[PDB]
């Protein structure tokens, strides 16, 4: 279901990205960032634009924001376009 079942350290599925997203979450951000690949010079793949602006969901913004810095990216701006704040029920 959601990503906070009871998993933490020392648990059977591997220790990973745990987001505070509810059941079928409907909140999503509008993020903007550059993310240079830092791996094209030994792989020699084709080049793709690294400056992107896209709507990521609340269910997986934290994983994406945690990963964009993994590969040296810089986050220029993020906002919560869709969803409420301090909302107990209704994020579903």
């Amino acid at each position: 279901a959601y990503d906070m079942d009871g998993t933490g350290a020392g648990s059977l599925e591997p220790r990973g990205i745990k987001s505070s997203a509810v059941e079928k979450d409907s909140r999503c951000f509008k993020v903007t960032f550059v993310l240079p690949s830092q791996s094209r010079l030994y792989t020699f793949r084709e080049l793709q634009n690294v400056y992107t602006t896209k709507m990521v969901p609340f269910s997986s913004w934290y994983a994406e924001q945690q990963r964009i810095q993994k590969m040296g990216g810089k986050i220029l701006k993020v906002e919560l376009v869709a969803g409420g704040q301090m909302r107990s029920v209704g994020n579903q």
Binding site: Y2, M4, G6, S20, V22, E23, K24, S88, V89, Q92
Partner: protein
């Protein structure tokens, strides 16, 4: 509620609501008169449902209240009953919403992280909700006790 997730179900599928979805929103709102009566019973029985709820909880789990238990002393025992007042409140929300969606994103999502991080035995708080369930279903008829008890055991399932 059943209205909001029957929508977001058909929302994701790029379609409207089927008869299977619209004959149940219809069936739920005619059920709404009976739901408020059930939640009205638990609303002003929280004095007995909570206090007798913590009654059986300490008789079944004296460790948590004994010296060394998490709810030891005048202080923690008050908060020991405070959480039961919380979860008894969320069950009143689930009965009126016709689903554990209110109980889902309040008191259930990531609950093991909180209680593990508070040092509280999560199995102990599960025992507390079960003791409240026998008090709650003892206050209602058989047709209602299949509902009010029905939301407690979901909270029991997610709390372990």
């Amino acid at each position: 509620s059943i209205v909001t997730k029957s929508i977001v179900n058909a929302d994701a599928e790029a379609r409207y609501l089927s008869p299977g979805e619209l004959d149940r929103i219809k069936s739920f709102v005619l059920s709404g008169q009976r739901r408020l009566r059930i939640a009205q019973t638990l609303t002003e029985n929280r004095e007995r449902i909570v206090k007798q709820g913590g009654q059986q909880l300490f008789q079944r789990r004296p460790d948590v209240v004994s010296p060394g238990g998490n709810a030891y002393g005048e202080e923690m025992t008050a908060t020991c009953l405070r959480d039961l007042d919380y979860y008894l409140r969320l069950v009143t929300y689930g009965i009126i919403a016709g689903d554990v969606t209110p109980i889902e994103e309040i008191g259930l999502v990531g609950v093991k992280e909180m209680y593990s991080a508070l040092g509280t035995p999560i199995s102990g708080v599960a025992e507390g909700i079960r003791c409240m369930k026998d008090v709650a279903c003892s206050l209602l008829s058989g047709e209602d006790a299949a509902e009010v008890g029905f939301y407690f055991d979901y909270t029991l399932a997610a709390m372990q």
